[PDB]
Design a protein around this ligand. Structure first.
Ligand SMILES: OC[C@H]1CN[C@H](O)[C@@H](O)[C@@H]1O[C@@H]1O[C@H](CO)[C@@H](O)[C@H](O)[C@H]1O
Ligand SMILES: [Ca+2]
Ligand SMILES: [Cl-]
Length: 512
């Protein structure tokens, strides 16, 4: 039998875990007890708040239609009401108690109608499109003009604030994203913005839209640039002006941060609150990218190791990013370095990601690691994106393990503390307390081996003596979170518990 040693010190490296790292785009089973929800993604670029119409772009026939009403569960009558996709979304956030991050259009046009495919020569401007104007500079209407050629973004923000109050209030919409994946506009939304976006163009569009938003709600958090992936972090997907603007910047991430900082300085107001990226691992195993399909045993093993690309300086995954751009990995410390230097005080969000294997134990184990990693690496907000339609049972299990492990919405603690393991390959472990508790200690531990159990010997440093523990977990046999055998013998703040292959447990220790 293999033994791993795990050292947990509740005094050491305490740091707040932002609850918004427990976040999603599509709602999952509904009992994950999320803290953040996003209304974002390709459909939002051309979403027209006045009539709820949007355009699929390259995802489906360049089709303008009422998909977002359908996706939101709206009736045909509700679909006709201005703002209804967004207000239905936010009403649900209020009911669930989550943050709402809402996307605003910046690519320049939105769908005028719901009448289907838009052909290449029907590209904007045309009868199929209304133009976006950031600041109306006229009296706002709660019932916007449906017959003109415009949608006014500040009018939409005024409409939300009129209904819910400002971002600083309990009921307010708190976050607005500057569109979605701008470096892919020319690929995903060729009917709206067929030219490759420029680096300077993206800053200028962003400054104009953010100013208009902040003029209505100074407390709203503006998220950008909502980058699709590493090619865009590097040079905005080969933006045509990159060589002319790049100067001494290592990557587009720095150019954007410094430019938003500079624009904010000149405007006299912060125009970027959260630096916003999407991260879909390029990590490969068994010849398959982990986000493409569950794959074979080597794909599964690579899926469970891939979260180390987020934090571990020693880990080199199999991908073109690690092959040609290793100096930018691990990615979270690299992003944080950039933000802290080029626009101090800006937060970091990963507003789409997935490690694949949605209905496989490997996808569950990967996510159990990622949620602990995000919480203790200064990520403000993170939102899973469903790459597979229908149930994603093992992704849901990972969230429930952290956020509803008992069926009563009991959670991991709000304060990360130091948890170290002797074997970073076969195990990962994350620890937390709440309000500096010396009474309850939370540990999430997992075995990534496909083959071999280990005995985890835990050594705990705390102000009081832990005397017993309850355990909940999931494994290859059941994605439901089941109660496991309790820990009844803890002597001198040490205990041992066997973790079978491909198993994740949440252990809750108590002093009383
Ligand atoms: O390809 C998966 C992700 C990549 N990021 C995009 O922002 C996101 O929109 C895209 O998912 C597509 O999303 C649209 C809805 O916006 C959906 O209809 C399509 O099936 C997804 O692939
Ligand atoms: Ca209008
Ligand atoms: Cl992008």
């Amino acid at each position: 039998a293999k033994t791993i040693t795990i050292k947990v010190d509740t005094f050491k490296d305490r740091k707040p875990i932002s609850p918004y790292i427990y976040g999603t785009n599509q709602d999952l089973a509904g009992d994950e007890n999320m803290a953040a929800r996003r209304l974002g993604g390709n459909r939002m670029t051309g979403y027209n708040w006045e009539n709820n119409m949007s355009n699929a772009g390259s995802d489906w026939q360049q089709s303008s239609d009422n998909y977002l009403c359908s996706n939101g569960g709206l009736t045909q009558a509700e679909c006709e009401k201005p703002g209804a996709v967004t207000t239905s979304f936010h009403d649900q956030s209020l009911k669930l108690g989550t943050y709402s991050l809402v996307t605003l259009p910046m690519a320049g046009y939105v769908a005028k109608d719901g009448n289907g495919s838009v052909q290449e020569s029907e590209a904007a401007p045309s009868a199929r499109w209304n133009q976006v104007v950031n600041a109306k500079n006229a009296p706002f209407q709660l019932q916007p003009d449906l017959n003109d050629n415009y949608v006014y973004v500040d009018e939409f923000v005024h409409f939300l604030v009129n209904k819910y109050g400002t971002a600083s209030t309990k009921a307010g919409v708190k976050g607005y994203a500057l569109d979605n994946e701008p470096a892919l506009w020319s690929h995903t939304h060729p009917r709206i913005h067929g030219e490759k976006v420029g680096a300077k163009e993206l800053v200028d569009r962003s400054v104009s839209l953010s100013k208009a938003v902040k003029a209505i709600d100074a407390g709203a958090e503006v998220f950008g640039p909502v980058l699709y992936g590493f090619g865009a972090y590097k040079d905005l997907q080969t933006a045509p002006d990159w060589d002319s603007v790049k100067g001494n910047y290592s990557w587009f991430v720095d150019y954007y941060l410094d430019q938003m900082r500079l624009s904010s300085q000149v405007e006299g107001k912060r125009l970027l609150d959260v630096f916003d990226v999407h991260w879909y691992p390029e990590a490969m195993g068994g010849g398959i990218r982990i986000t493409n399909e569950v794959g074979n045993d080597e794909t599964k093993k690579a899926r469970m190791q891939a979260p180390r690309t987020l934090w571990d300086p020693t880990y080199k995954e199999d991908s073109w990013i690690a092959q040609w751009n290793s100096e930018f990995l691990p990615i979270l410390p690299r992003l944080k370095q950039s933000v802290d230097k080029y626009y101090p005080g800006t937060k970091l969000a990963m507003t789409e990601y997935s490690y694949g294997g949605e209905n496989d134990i490997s996808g569950g184990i990967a996510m159990t690691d990622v949620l602990g990693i995000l919480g203790k690496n200064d990520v403000y907000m993170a939102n899973y994106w469903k790459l597979k339609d229908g149930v994603n049972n093992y992704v849901s299990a990972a969230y429930k393990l952290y956020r509803n492990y008992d069926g009563k919405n009991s959670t991991f603690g709000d304060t990360s503390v130091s948890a170290q393991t002797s074997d970073i390959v076969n195990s990962s472990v994350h620890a937390s307390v709440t309000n500096a508790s010396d009474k309850e200690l939370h540990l999430v531990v997992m075995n990534k081996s496909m083959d071999s159990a280990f005995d985890a010997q835990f050594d705990l440093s705390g102000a009081k003596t832990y005397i017993s523990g309850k355990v909940w977990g999931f494994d290859k046999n059941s994605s439901q979170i089941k109660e496991a055998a309790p820990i009844t013998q803890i002597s001198g703040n040490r205990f041992t518990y066997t973790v079978p292959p491909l198993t994740a447990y949440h252990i809750v220790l108590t002093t009383g």
